[PDB]
Design a binder for this molecule. Structure first.
Ligand SMILES: N[C@@H](C(=O)O)c1ccc(O)cc1
Ligand SMILES: N[C@@H](C(=O)O)c1ccc(O)cc1
Lengths: 387, 60
């Protein structure tokens, strides 16, 4: 599948439902689809072709969502660039990814590197779409991991759709998801694409960091689900855990989350679902998760949890044999959601996206983390192998 | 040390039906659906083979 294919089902089912809320600008599903179609026509008219990488340099906004969908409709892959990155980093991402064109705004126009065609989103063209395809690239997101050297993770449409359409997210048409993560990071796949393939709405956060006060205001305005980075979640959990009250679900991941932070939230907010996410950019946002249902208490340890539906995990020793529960070993992730690899770096790809001994012809991603199983098939984190 | 990072190890290059390449420690049974196409050879030698011969990451 593709996220555009899943979105199209929702445009057909409820075209006049709200899709994007950006300050006073509100886009319905049909309006979002038509706007993206017009910009797709503009991109095709400027020469964008299937498989091209198109860089994006925009502040979070409805125009950002329109742009990503338009790039996809043109058959291309987006290369998300944070407008606050230094110019050498922007130049590297554009050149390394092979992007010759960059969508920008008046405000970000000066950040387009020399020699790159600027397409100003704020500037009439006829609607046209090449159509997204599951084997084509959807985006190239850059990660430096724990190395410090950034590499572009090339993720195909099929993997983005496997993530966004996963039945476990439990996002419904009445949900409103707060959007504030950088679209250069893949938490944005939950904040943007999960609600849109589900019939819900994306609520663009006001500029600046989302703190406890702004979270409370967003919830009062109708937000029902929100993801916080591990650092931000730990802070709010310890300082103001009652600020999560009224959310259907709060999500967090990225770095270590101590069980004590989750316990603080559950104590203040008995009815909030709390979901812990784990996974690298190389396997599309998250590969495992742990959900604390309302009323349940977290133990002394917060698992990274169980593989998402459609995914698998293995804990192997140095001989590549599976270990028994309670034994720490190397964690490998498989099933749905794998990236194609690292753009322009086949050798690096072949040493990290390796053959899966448990699934014929398939690959598994070598996380570089250590983990152990619980007796009933959840995973506990045991630190980075190199830390 | 993870066996895929062992610079003193002996390695194969494997290819699946989609043309995707994998390094593989020569001591381990080759997974079903994968064919050895290079090695046993050094880790660095196998990386060179992959870079030379795997030119499009897209699955065939
Ligand atoms: N994909 C990782 C990351 O980019 O660090 C991630 C994992 C869990 C989460 O909640 C957010 C991001
Ligand atoms: N994979 C590392 C990391 O990206 O820093 C990681 C380790 C533990 C955890 O709970 C989340 C991520």
């Amino acid at each position: 599948s593709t996220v555009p294919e899943l979105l199209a089902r929702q445009v057909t089912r409820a075209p006049d439902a709200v899709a994007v809320v950006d300050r006073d600008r509100v886009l319905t599903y049909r309006e979002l689809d038509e706007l993206a179609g017009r910009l797709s026509g503009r991109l095709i008219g400027r020469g964008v072709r299937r498989g091209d990488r198109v860089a994006v340099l925009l502040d979070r906004s409805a125009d950002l969502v329109v742009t990503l969908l338009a790039i996809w409709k043109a058959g291309a892959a987006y290369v998300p660039v944070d407008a606050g990155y230094p110019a050498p980093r922007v130049a590297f991402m554009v050149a390394d990814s092979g992007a010759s064109r960059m969508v920008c705004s008046a405000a970000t126009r000066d950040g387009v590197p020399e020699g790159i065609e600027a397409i100003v989103v704020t500037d009439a063209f006829e609607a046209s779409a090449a159509g997204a395809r599951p084997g084509d690239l959807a985006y190239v997101m850059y990660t430096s991991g724990s190395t410090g050297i950034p590499k572009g993770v090339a993720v195909p449409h099929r993997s983005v759709a496997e993530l966004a359409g996963n039945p476990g997210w439990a996002v419904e048409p009445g949900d409103a998801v707060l959007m504030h993560a950088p679209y250069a990071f893949d938490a944005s796949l939950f904040e943007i694409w999960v609600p849109l393939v589900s019939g819900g709405r994306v609520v663009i956060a006001e500029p600046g960091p989302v703190d406890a006060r702004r979270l409370r205001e967003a919830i009062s305005s109708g937000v029902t689900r929100a993801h916080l980075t591990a650092g931000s979640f730990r802070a709010v959990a310890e300082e103001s855990p009652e600020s999560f009250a009224g959310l259907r679900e709060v999500l967090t991941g990225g770095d270590v989350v101590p069980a004590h932070a989750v316990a603080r939230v559950r104590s203040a907010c008995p009815r909030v679902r709390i979901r812990h996410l784990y996974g690298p950019t190389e396997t599309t946002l998250c590969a495992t998760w742990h959900l604390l249902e309302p009323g349940d208490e977290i133990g002394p340890v917060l698992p990274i949890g169980r593989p998402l539906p459609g995914r698998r995990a293995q804990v192997l020793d140095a001989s590549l044999r599976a270990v028994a529960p309670g034994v720490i070993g190397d964690l490998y992730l498989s099933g749905a959601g794998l990236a194609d690899g690292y753009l322009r770096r086949a050798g690096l790809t072949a040493e990290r996206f390796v053959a899966d001994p448990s699934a014929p012809g398939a690959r598994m991603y070598r996380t570089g983390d250590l983990a152990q199983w619980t007796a009933d098939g959840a995973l506990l984190f045991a630190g980075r192998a190199d830390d | 040390t993870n066996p895929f990072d062992n610079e003193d190890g002996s390695f194969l290059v494997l290819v699946n039906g989609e043309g995707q390449h994998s390094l593989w420690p020569a001591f381990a049974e080759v997974p079903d659906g994968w064919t050895g196409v290079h090695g046993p050879a050094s880790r660095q030698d196998c990386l060179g083979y992959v870079e030379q011969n795997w030119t499009d990451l897209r699955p065939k």
